[PDB]
Design a protein around this ligand. Structure first.
Ligand code: CL
Length: 254
């Protein structure tokens, strides 16, 4: 099988061995603290922004209601720096073989206050430094997109993704579990992209992080189901943060 390190904290060197060997690993909240040098209280400062995400009104597929925001960055590895870049669209071609065309989506920008938190930079930088140890990006630069999400069961019906498991068309992905209430389901699955092996596990502790080598694994999560569907007024949602890292540039039409 494959290792789901969801109970014990991985150090950076073990996390690297895991990503090389199986193409993903899980960092417990304690492992994230150790990796980033930031205590969990500093990460908690980000939580109120998940109450202010913008509705994503682009799809009308009868799925659960989606809220999000979007922001992009460039990380330089030596000398280390992280900087914002101008707000930009997110590309969604029907295939990562696409050179041109496809859908470009404008979302609302991340809160400026959130991106100036110490934990925000600590998070993006530490993960970039880790990922560059597996596969160094061209010119020592990562192009990073951040997608904070809330999926709310107050409306819509959750169904399996038509496409099944996906990759993101980048080099590395981090899925950070931010929180959840009033729901079950939302189980993550990670599969070997070139073999039959897979794992299932449910992220439950805030600041648990799933690290993915986007060229070696594919992933998905199962639909949410309200714990108390009989009662509307009880909040029922799941919060995540998806960070993508890409060499060369942001995914974009030529
Ligand atoms: Cl690609």
């Amino acid at each position: 099988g494959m290792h789901v390190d969801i109970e014990l904290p991985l150090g950076r060197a073990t996390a690297l061995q895991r990503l090389r060997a199986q193409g993903f690993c899980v960092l417990t909240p304690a492992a994230l603290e150790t990796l980033t040098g930031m205590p969990l209280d500093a990460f908690d400062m980000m939580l109120p922004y998940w109450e202010e995400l913008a509705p994503d009104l682009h799809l009308k597929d009868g799925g659960h209601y989606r809220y999000r925001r979007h922001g992009c960055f460039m990380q330089t590895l030596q000398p280390g720096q992280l900087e914002t870049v101008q707000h930009r669209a997110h590309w969604q071609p029907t295939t990562y073989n696409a050179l041109h065309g496809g859908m470009e989506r404008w979302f609302e920008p991340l809160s400026n206050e959130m991106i100036h938190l110490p934990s925000w930079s600590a998070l993006l930088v530490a993960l970039g430094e880790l990922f560059a140890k597996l596969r160094a990006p061209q010119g020592g630069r990562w192009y990073i997109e951040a997608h904070p999400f809330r999926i709310d069961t107050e409306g819509g019906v959750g169904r399996p993704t038509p496409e099944g498991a996906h990759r993101d068309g980048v080099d590395f992905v981090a899925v950070v579990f931010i929180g959840r209430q009033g729901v079950r389901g939302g189980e993550t699955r990670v599969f070997d992209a070139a073999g039959p092996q897979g794992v299932r596990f449910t992220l439950e502790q805030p600041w648990t992080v799933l690290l993915l080598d986007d060229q070696q694994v594919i992933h998905e999560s199962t639909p949410l189901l309200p714990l108390d569907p009989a009662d509307p007024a009880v909040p029922a949602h799941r919060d995540t943060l998806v960070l993508t890292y890409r060499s060369g540039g942001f995914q974009a039409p030529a």
